[PDB]
Homo-oligomer: A and B are copies of this chain.
Amino acid sequence: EDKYDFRALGLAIKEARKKQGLTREQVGAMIEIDPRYLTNIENKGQHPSLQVLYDLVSLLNVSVDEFFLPASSQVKSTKRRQLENKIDNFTDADLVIMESVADGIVKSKEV
């Protein structure tokens, strides 16, 4: 059909959950859903309700836009969000290292 393919979003939810050291039973107790229901959402592309989607992504900090919208500079991916969290306390001199390397990644692409 022309059903939305939730598989990539479900796998991103599973990845975040595992990277953050959480079991499905923890996630289940936290947002009040059944662990088995979480398996099908993560592993099999079963669509959760909007309520369950909101609860998982707000609990884990997973970008929905990444998977719903065409990739653009108006979309902050999960990775980008996590990066920003990491650099929150950075000084400017830290940031100048950061900026320099972003430029190097750009120039790298022409090499």
Seen from chain A, the residues whose Cβ lies within 8 Å of a Cβ on chain B are 2-4, 6, 32, 47-51, 53-55, 57-58, 61, 63-65, 68-70, 72-77, 79-90, 92, 94-99, 101-103, 105-106, 109
Q: What chain B residues lie within 8 Å of A103 (beta carbons)?
A: 86
Question: Are A73 and B97 in contact, CB atoms less than 8 angstroms apart?
Answer: no
Copies in the complex: 2
User: Contact at B58–A69, with CB atoms within 8 Å?
Assistant: yes
In order of increasing CB-CB distance, the 4 nearest A-B pairs are A73-B88, A79-B95, A47-B50, A64-B64
From the candidates B49, B77, B90, B97, name the one contacting A80 in the complex (CB within 8 A).
B90
A68 touches B73 (CB 8 A): no
